[PDB]
């Protein structure tokens, strides 16, 4: 499957793509403002994620740091990124269908649209100014808006027991972005697409 990753932000981002235990395609790349990078993701990929990283520095070997979304200091991510990270999430070719969503469960750094480029389903978007409106206690000094689990490490925010409800913090993410997951047990906003659809992830779509 192809994913065109497009940076419409006015700032550079370092895109990342991983399924947690491996890179997808090259795993990461710099995207200056306006650039597009198209990756290939193997059919059947389960639990894939794409995200933006901000304020990165990498040496000639591809090792360094980012302020949001850092994946073990690598340009080419093999693992998931450090919160806060707005997440484009997908599982492909799952009994004949693809499943896509956006999640704020690991916080928010960059606004995102995640849409199919082929027929048969809609896209999802979280493009509100979550960083600017972020509750004081969730603001990440390194940049972005943390989720409450990251900040407070409670069973209720992290849904550790698989019993948790919405919270004042989850409701903030949900109010700003109704079409993204705001906590682990949120009413799903997952979209079913035809198996083997192709996609575009756009940072700063509006």
From Swiss-Prot:
InterPro entries (UniProt xref): Osmotin/thaumatin-like_sf (IPR037176), Thaumatin (IPR001938), Thaumatin_CS (IPR017949)
Disulfide bridge positions per record: 9-204, 56-66, 71-77, 121-193, 126-177, 134-145, 149-158, 159-164
Annotated GO CC locations: cytoplasmic vesicle
Compartmental location: Cytoplasmic vesicle
Main location: cytoplasm
Family designation: Belongs to the thaumatin family.
Protein name: Thaumatin I
Organism: Thaumatococcus daniellii (Katemfe)
